[PDB]
Design a protein around this ligand. Structure first.
Ligand SMILES: [Cl-]
Ligand SMILES: [Cl-]
Ligand SMILES: [Cl-]
Length: 124
C-alpha cells in the first residue's frame, strides 16, 4: 500500500512546470497519475512548486482542517496550482476534466516524522 506522504505526492505534486499550459492538462495528468483507474476522481489539485516548498507548508500557518482536526497548515505565500474537476457530463472510463490554473494559498494536512503533507485540504 502507498504511504500517505507518497500518495499526496502522486496526487498533488507537479513541480515539472510552472503552470498548466493547456486545457488538456488535467485530462493528461489525471490519467498519468493513475487517478482515473476504476472511477474518475472528481476533484484534484496539482501544485506547481517544488516538493520542498510544499513540504515547508507543514511549518507555516496552523489552521483547522475542514474536518475540524488541527494538523492543517496554510501556506504563507500563494502557489501556482491547477485545479482539475470532472465536467458534469464526464463518464468513466472516458473521464473528462476542466483545467483551472490559479495562484492561491494551499492548505495541507501534515503528519508523521518527518512531518509532511498527507492531504490536500483546500486552496484559497
Ligand atoms: Cl503512511
Ligand atoms: Cl500509481
Ligand atoms: Cl484536491
Amino acid at each position: 500500500k502507498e504511504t500517505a506522504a507518497a500518495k499526496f505526492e502522486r496526487q498533488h505534486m507537479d513541480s515539472s512546470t510552472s503552470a498548466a499550459s493547456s486545457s488538456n492538462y488535467c485530462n493528461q495528468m489525471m490519467k498519468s497519475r493513475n487517478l482515473t483507474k476504476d472511477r474518475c476522481k472528481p476533484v484534484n489539485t496539482f501544485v506547481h512548486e517544488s516538493l520542498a516548498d510544499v513540504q515547508a507548508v507543514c511549518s507555516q500557518k496552523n489552521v483547522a482542517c475542514k474536518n475540524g482536526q488541527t494538523n492543517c497548515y496554510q501556506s504563507y505565500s500563494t502557489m501556482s496550482i491547477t485545479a482539475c474537476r470532472e465536467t458534469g457530463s464526464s463518464k468513466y472510463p472516458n473521464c473528462a476534466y476542466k483545467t483551472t490554473q490559479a495562484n492561491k494559498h494551499i492548505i495541507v494536512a501534515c503528519e508523521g516524522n518527518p512531518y509532511v503533507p498527507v492531504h490536500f485540504d483546500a486552496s484559497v
